[PDB]
Amino acid sequence: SADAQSFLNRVCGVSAARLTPCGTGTSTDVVYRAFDIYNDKVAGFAKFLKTNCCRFQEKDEDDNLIDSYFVVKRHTFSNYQHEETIYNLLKDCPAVAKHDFFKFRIDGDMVPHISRQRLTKYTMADLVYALRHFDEGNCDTLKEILVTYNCCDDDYFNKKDWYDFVENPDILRVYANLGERVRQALLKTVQFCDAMRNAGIVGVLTLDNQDLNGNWYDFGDFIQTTPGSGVPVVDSYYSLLMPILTLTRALTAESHVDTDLTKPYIKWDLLKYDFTEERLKLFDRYFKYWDQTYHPNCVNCLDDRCILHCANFNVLFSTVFPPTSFGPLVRKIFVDGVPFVVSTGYHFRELGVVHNQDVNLHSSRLSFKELLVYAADPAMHAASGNLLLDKRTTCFSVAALTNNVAFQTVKPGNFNKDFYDFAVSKGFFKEGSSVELKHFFFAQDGNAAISDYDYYRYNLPTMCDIRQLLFVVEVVDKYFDCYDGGCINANQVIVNNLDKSAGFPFNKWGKARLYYDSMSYEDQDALFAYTKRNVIPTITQMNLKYAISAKNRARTVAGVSICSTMTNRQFHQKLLKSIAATRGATVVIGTSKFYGGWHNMLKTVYSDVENPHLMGWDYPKCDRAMPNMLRIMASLVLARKHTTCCSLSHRFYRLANECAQVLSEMVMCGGSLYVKPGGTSSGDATTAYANSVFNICQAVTANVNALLSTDGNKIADKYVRNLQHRLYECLYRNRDVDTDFVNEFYAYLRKHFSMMILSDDAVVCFNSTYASQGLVASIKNFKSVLYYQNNVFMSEAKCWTETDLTKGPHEFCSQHTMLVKQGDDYVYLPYPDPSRILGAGCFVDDIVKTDGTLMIERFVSLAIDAYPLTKHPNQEYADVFHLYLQYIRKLHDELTGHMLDMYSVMLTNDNTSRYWEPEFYEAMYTPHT
Amino acid sequence: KMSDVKCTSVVLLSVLQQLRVESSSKLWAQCVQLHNDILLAKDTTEAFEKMVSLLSVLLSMQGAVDINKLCEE
Amino acid sequence: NNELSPVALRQMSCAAGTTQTACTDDNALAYYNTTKGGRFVLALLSDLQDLKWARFPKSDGTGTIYTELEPPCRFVTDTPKGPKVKYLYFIKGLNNLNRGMVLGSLAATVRLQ
Amino acid sequence: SSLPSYAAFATAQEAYEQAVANGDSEVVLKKLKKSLNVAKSEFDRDAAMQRKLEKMADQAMTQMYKQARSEDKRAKVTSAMQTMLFTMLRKLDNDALNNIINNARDGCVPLNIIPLTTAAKLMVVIPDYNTYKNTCDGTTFTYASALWEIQQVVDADSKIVQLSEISMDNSPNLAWPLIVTALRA
Amino acid sequence: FSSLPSYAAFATAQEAYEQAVANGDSEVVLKKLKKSLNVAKSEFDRDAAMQRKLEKMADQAMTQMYKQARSEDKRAKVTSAMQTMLFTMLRKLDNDALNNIINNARDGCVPLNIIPLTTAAKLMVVIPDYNTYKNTCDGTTFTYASALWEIQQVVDADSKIVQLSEISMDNSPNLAWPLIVTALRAN
RNA sequence: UGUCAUGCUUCGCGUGGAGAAUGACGUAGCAUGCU
RNA sequence: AGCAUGCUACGUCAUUCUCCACGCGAAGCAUG
Ligand SMILES: Nc1nc2c(ncn2[C@@H]2O[C@H](COP(=O)(O)OP(O)(O)=S)[C@@H](O)[C@H]2O)c(=O)[nH]1
Ligand SMILES: Nc1nc2c(ncn2[C@@H]2O[C@H](COP(=O)(O)OP(O)(O)=S)[C@@H](O)[C@H]2O)c(=O)[nH]1
Ligand SMILES: [Mg+2]
Ligand SMILES: [Zn+2]
Ligand SMILES: [Zn+2]
Secondary structure, X not given: OOHHHHHHHHHHOOOOOOEEEOOXXXXXXXXXXXXXXXXXXXXXXXXXXXXXXEEEEEEEOOOEEEEEEEEEEEOOHHHHHHHHHHHHHHOOOOOEOOEEEEEEEEOOXXXXXXXXXXXXXXXXXXXXXHHHOOOOOOOHHHHHXXXXXXXXXXXXXXXXXXXXXXXXXXXXHHHHOOHHHHHHHHHHHHHHHHHHHHHOEEEEOOHHHXXXXXXXXXXXXXXXXXXXXXXXXXXXXXXXXXXXXXXXXOOHHHOEHHHOXXXXXXXXXXXXXXXXXXXXXXXXXXXXXXXXXXXXXXXXXXXXXXXXXXXHHHHHHHHHOOHHHXXXXXXXXXXXXXXXXXXXXXXXXXXXXXXXXXXXXXXXXXXXXXHHHHHHOOHHHHXXXXXXXXXXXXXXXXXXXXXXXXXXXXXXXXXXXXXXXXXXXXXXXXXXXOOOOOOEOOOEOOOHHHHHHHHHHHOOOOOOOHHHHHHHHHHHOOOOOOOOOOOOOOOOOOOOOOOOOOOOOHHHOOOHHHHHHOOOHHHHHHHHHHOOOOXXXXXXXXXXXXXXEOOOOOOEEEEOOHHHHHHHHHHHHHHHHHHOOOOXXXXXXXXXXXXXXXXXXXXXXXXXXXXXXXXXXXXXXXXXXXXXXXXXXXXXXXXXXXXXXXOHHHHHHHHHHHHHHHHOOEEEOOOEEEEOOOOOOOXXXXXXXXHHHHHHHHHHHHHHHHHHOOOOOOOOOOHHHHHHHHHHHHHHOOOOOOHHHHHHXXXXXXXXXXXXXXXXXXXXXXXXXXXXXXXXXXXXXXXXXXXXXXXXXXXXXXXXEEOOOOOOOOOEOOEEEEEEEOOOOEEEEEEOOXXXXXXXXXXXXXXXXXXXXXXXXXXXXXXXXXXXHHHOXXXXXXXXXXXXXXXXXXXXXXXXXXXXXXXXXXOOOOOHHHOOOOHHHHHHHXXXX | OHHXXXXXXXXXXXXXXXXXXXXXXXXXXXXXXXXXXXXXXXXXXXXXXXXXXXXXHHHHOOOOOOHHHHHHO | OEOOOOOOOEEEEEEEOOOOOOOEEEEEEEEEEOOOOOOEEEEEEEOOOOOOXXXXXXXXXXXXXXXXXXXXXXXXXXXXXXXXXXXXXXXOOXXXXXXXXXXXXXXXXXXXX | OOOOOHHHHHHHHHHHHHHHOOOOOHHHHHHHHHHHHHHHHHHHHHHHHHHHHHHHHHHHHHHHHHHHHHHHHHHOOOHXXXXXXXXXXXXXXXXXXXXXXXXXXXXXXXXXXXXXOOOOEEEEXXXXXXXXXXXEOOXXXXXXXXXXXXXXXXXXXXXXXXXXXXXXXXXXXXXXXXXXXXXXX | OOHHHHHHHHHHHHHHHHHHHXXXXXXXXXXXXHHHHHHHHHHHXXXXXXXXXXXXXXXXXXXXXXXXXXXXXXXXXXXXXXXXXXXXXXXXXXOOHXXXXXXXXXXXXXXXXXXXXXXXXXXXXXXXXXXHHHHHOOOOEEEOOOOEEEEEEEEOOOOOEOOOOOOXXXXXXXXXXXXXXXXXXXX
């Protein structure tokens, strides 16, 4: 305590600060902190261990510690000179922490020291790392950051799920208490940049050189040039920080007057729909030194790689403006000298203002196409309707189209007593058996359809890291390059079922057949051509489902209009029909499990992976919680097949139409028009394929995050150590696409991470010795990526792993796998849940299905599904297939006995003897066909 | 006897729905709650209590069904 | 440790003029790196202040590319016999990182005062 | 077989028996073979036509049976459900269900849903003295295999009758439809 | 086309064999009558096949024509229905407030979401519980969207009329929620 | 009120190949007529 | 020997069923 007190007094300086010894200067301190690093050896945003610093903590009067630290260091004589010279230029900035340079005597040597004064304990890199790599079992840093700034108390974490966005929505509020601080940082950084440019300093701004007040304190890698011409490089700062700006709602002080949280809100003109100037002001205030050009309206964008860039900022800035200014833009026209109200534009929260190019005032007469277009849009349905204030939901309600509110209910379900009695007589449904009933028809009351719609409160505005998304999009476009696409004519479109509903209002006059036969090919082609330079809003109708399930939750489906589907088929069907005809790809839509398809799919997935393991995951609230940026991305990769048939403007207007009538639109729920925030619509023509694109995007993002957050000084393999140094450059320092590295990363992902994707279901075979070392994604990385990019917490109870590959996936498409012996060779076969089959047998959804003699095809199909259970070690599983065969025999006997009594004819020609013999069902799982 | 009550509840709620109990929101809500609670029950005594409540709902409506004829069949 | 790009640069000698026309040969020095598919001219050093265009020789048949230029910035070098004043123009539409590369390399090469 | 034109295909067949015999007279055997082939083809054609007829007839019969049974199922969907419900309820053989069903059959139905809580209001309609005799014994009321505590009893006309009154001695003195309120014990 | 050649030539075709029955001799005429009968039979077969094909073609053409003509009398009905719907909706617009808001706009464009707010003549409020009713629609007159609304009627989820005096804390458990209240814009 | 895709089973009407049978023109063996 | 007729064999055109390949309708089951 002889030299130690001398050093303490030295550090105290002349600032009149009372310092306690936290870590002695002579005996320094070490910590574990998140750093952004790029030298010629390592590169990444990862959590390392520091030594060099020695910290002292300031105690305020009354002997109480506060959040002020003096951080002394020991520097070599050269960096000392460099840093002092660079600081003597920036000292005047209000966003630069005070420094103190002094030499001290240690072991008979003069050692320099640089002391920074009054720094918060953590930095902004720690905050970003904590919220971007989330593990609920290790949240010490995040908890301390939240508690220190009065975001919550320390008793808030004794709750069940204090971090779950779905179980505990209030957590959002907690995070929103970090907004102002973040915003203040975004201001100070700009000041710093200005100072740099005025002083002639060139350097890279990183997150870990700014504390949580907003002071900058590291100048070791800066250089000097002529005054007045500096260059701050800000690409990995803003990009890494982007997902945090929307989670903590950093720009909520822009809604008040004079940008002060105490003053009231701004009252905007109710007729104002154009906010281009405000968007430019916001961009120039918070992102002044962001190089790439920003277009408030995405009509003027240049590529599909620019629409994402600009739509990110539009997503950020649209939270500041009133919610009543987004939607169709209405105008008054005259037809036959009578006024009409029609849509002639659209104000997208993510794409800006769009105006139709073909607007015709003073019309004379309307043809079938014009009547269809004018009756499809919600202009005159909402204009000529009552006002609505629905307090049961938090979704913007537009209007009420009638004088009543409809309350729709679901019915119980029917009981097939004869089959149940037969099964009971066969020794089923006893006490303590392994096969029982779990799937029933659940009933619902009148409030089902609106309570189901109120789950769109899980869709939140999610800004994305753009420099990373622009790389993931290029790596995802290689999974779709063995297909072909383009536009077809009205002659080449295939419609499977023409007896389906045509949405609203078209369902009041006929089915989908009424409009395909009343509309010549010229009419359909003209409508499709019209949609390429105009925006046609439509209305989707929400309906309840009547189906068997194991859960007490209602299910809804969204039926889209006929104008949407008619023109989406001519745009996407050529590619969608080619994705479903390819065998051996990552996406396995269109492949069957019969005649040896399951075995082929599993063998293709296994491929040649070393130390293989199998994993599978699930997406919580998939359709509801999907962000609006990944859906736009999914639609943009699917439209890259139109390079020759469509120009840039045609492609943009197709994107605008898809957004206006699928992504965000007006929904008809009980006779009232509400506004849909976002997500996915079940009834659109590209649901499964968009879900597949989204799945692959999330998996690739998980892999990138896994690889870039590893030390890099410990990756023994030298190829995988350069593949990480080059990935950081391709993300945060390369601007244009590097075509020779997306191929290398794609091959790397294909050899060590094999995927099998079908809509939102996925199975993965991965190299186990690379995952435990952090070189390929794990389940923790998926949980981390679903938190900041999907606003959802994925629990490690719906995800499964399998270390033995002779047992197959635990589940894929609700089927289990079994390795059976089938004629001299072993093969993987699928089998279902026996309770599902028995429930399908027992409970039917129509009274006419409870007469077996009329329904023998039902049981043939069910036995086809239930055959693979015959080969199960458990004996109560193999006795479901035999039950079905015996019941088929009984039904045939009854039918024959009835035909002889009611009539006098014995059905002369019969071949039904094959249905109750087990050789008819084996052929469905044998490879010959 | 669990798999017997789980089917008797289905038949009973169908019978109630045919008598047009759907025309009262409160009664239909209570019946739906009971019916969906019997189908997710792992204990038999709870299922029997809820069956008693639902059958009382059925028996309140005197003129809807002729119990004497049905019980003498 | 997040350093500026270590990439070094190479010199070319070219010319330019005030407008699309009037371009006169051998009156500017361009900086480039060829590690890309070809040569990318990153910036232009000259002695005059009225330049507003650049005619760089294109590696194609009868190809002449006219790249636009930004406003000047005045630097004082001292490598030759004594102090000299030269103006720098950055190719319009050049991200900040390549500007940092060019400025760092040039400032290291010449003291710049 | 047994078709009207089938006989020829057999007669010539018998002639084929003679074709082998008699040392296979070339001219006779060949002309007979030609006629036999013609007859066989004619009979085969007629048989095919009959088979087509039979297929059509069977399809028609199946369609008619389907329609009849579908209409039958859709017509009787009210008596069948109730009969099934009561068959199943009798098979279950519970105590509470049988108690309440018997009381309902004798006219003592409830007025609200039976509450499954320690303290809840249950109202029942005792029609006659006899149901009162059997169910209530003092200040307790046994229903649905549970004990309830009478808190009030009301007559057909709004009136607060007292337990002391309601006995055989004064059985005819009150309008009989008797509402009884009770709380679960 | 096939009936005529049959009924004409088959007479001679069978007369050829009738002559064989008459004679018995003329074994050469056996082959000659073979030729005659087979020629007539084959020519018939050909013509009859052509006739049957033509009949099927004509039947299919007639069916196609009928189906087409039935798909053009349903285009007209749907056209008329759409026009009637559009005119019915049009005649329900108060062209006094609507014109005011459309004319106060800069270029005539206005967002759709504001048209019901500023021009609608009726309001519907759907209230789940009693606290919401107390805090939103309490009294016989309230304020929403910078305007004054007067309660015109209240009904429950069964479409039964509810009096404003029945909506109290004590009687709340005896109502069928939610309550739908329809109100009229005050002047 | 009853959406988008994919797979499989059953029944019914239509087009193109191969096997068996019946009828006219060409080539081979034997017999009769003209020479 | 040449031509014609008769008997027995091989090569092209019209019908009768029998199996495959391919289209259009109707019903049903399963999956996301
Ligand atoms: N704000 C603050 N930071 C601290 C503290 N203790 C350790 N650190 C870490 O120390 C670095 C500063 O180092 P400096 O800027 O001089 O250069 P360098 O070490 O990064 S190289 C930061 O990045 C932090 O992670 C503390 O109490 N407060
Ligand atoms: N059109 C249609 N789509 C369906 C249906 N079932 C499921 N999906 C789609 O499959 C994904 C996962 O389903 P979801 O996240 O909702 O959870 P789940 O337990 O029902 S599988 C969602 O993107 C859904 O759009 C359906 O019937 N019709
Ligand atoms: Mg640092
Ligand atoms: Zn742009
Ligand atoms: Zn195209």
